[PDB]
Amino acid sequence: TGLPTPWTVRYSKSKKREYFFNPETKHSQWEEPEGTNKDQLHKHLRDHPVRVRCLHILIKHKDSRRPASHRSENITISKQDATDELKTLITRLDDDSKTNSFEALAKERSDCSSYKRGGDLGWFGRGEMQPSFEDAAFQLKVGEVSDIVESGSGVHVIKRVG
């Protein structure tokens, strides 16, 4: 909302950038369309964003689609084993710690390839992540940490930083 007609605000996966689309003219532009309620869009995107940026920690389990990370090329633990481990992991969380920061915990234990980037998945929109993951990420506020989220890849804990 805030947008005239028939404009829509969208997210460019290729550019990691918000843009504006006219479906009648098939025109796309980065700049806001003439006619817009400026701050009705801003606190529409603030409260209902079209892009978010997240960190996550992935612990895979036996019934995961891809039970083979850089840590083990065959993963044997249960779902509750992975969960209580992730729970214990999250209990260390400390933004001021060099070894217990979310980034560090990701680097220490996360089975996702993003472990080497501090669990940084970068910006993403609604056509990209697993539905279970997305529905938790977009419900989070900036700076907020999620509870345990189950997906096909494994279990996650998510931090939204953007």
Active site residue 44: no
Strand order in the sheet with 17-22: 8-12, 17-22, 27-29
Whether 48 and 120 have beta carbons less than 8 Å apart is answered as: no
36 DSSP 8-state letter: -
The domain in which residue 121 lies consists of 52-160
Active site residue 156: yes
Of 20, 44, 18, 43, residue with least CA distance to 32? 20
Q: 88, exposed or middle or buried, with CB in 10 Å at 0-12, 13-18, 19+?
A: exposed
Q: Out of 12, 101, 130, 132, pick the active-site residue.
A: 130
Q: Out of 64, 69, 110, 153, pick the active-site residue.
A: 153
CATH assignment at residue 71? 3.10.50.40
d(CA 68, CA 48): 35
Peptide bond before residue 33 is cis, with ω within 30 degrees of 0: no
- Identify the residue whose tokens are 């609604």: 126
Of 145, 112, 105, residue with least CA distance to 130? 112
- In three-state secondary structure terms, 115 is helix
Active site residue 70: no
Q: Out of 64, 112, 114, 146, pick the active-site residue.
A: 112
d(CA 24, CA 141): 34
120 DSSP 8-state letter: E
Whether 30 and 64 have beta carbons less than 8 Å apart is answered as: no
Q: Out of 54, 56, 61, 114, pick the active-site residue.
A: 56
Number of other CB atoms surrounding residue 131 within 10 Å: 10
